[PDB]
Amino acid sequence: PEWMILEAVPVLPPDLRPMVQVDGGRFATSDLNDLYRRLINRNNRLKKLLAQGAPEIIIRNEKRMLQEAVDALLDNGRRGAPVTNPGSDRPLRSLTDILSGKQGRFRQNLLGKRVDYSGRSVIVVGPQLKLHQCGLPKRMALELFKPFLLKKMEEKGIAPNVKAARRMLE
């Protein structure tokens, strides 16, 4: 049990809290980074406040801020709600709630993966069709079974190779 008190805050990976180029000159970054700064800045200002000299009202005042910040990245909202700046009085997302949102009670809130070889269209009664089968649009079969086709393309004179077969069908 000594570990329940935090003195070393783990930082989530970077590619998991991207910084990306959007459109025109707009940059989009993971909310988490605005909280991390908070922590970092407060933690630093703290150190500098200790070394500069220390009026203790001022050290606790910040030790508090610091604590609040340590909360923020972990879980926002269990106490007070962080907002970057006017535009979105929207709680900055936070680790805790990223994990939760994953599997928590909502209709499937954010539950479900998207498969790579899929497809959907309008259905229509296939009277002659047997139980056994189902009518599938060839045009669909094509990008559905694209890789499977590519090589049989190669197995027959239609195309010399794999990239050939690809541009042949682009």
């Binding site: 009202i57 005042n61 508090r64 609040e68 007070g80």
Partner: peptide
């Protein structure tokens, strides 16, 4: 409670 008032109370 609400972190502004108790600090204000504190140094004021």
């Amino acid at each position: 409670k609400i972190s502004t008032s108790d600090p204000v109370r504190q140094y004021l």
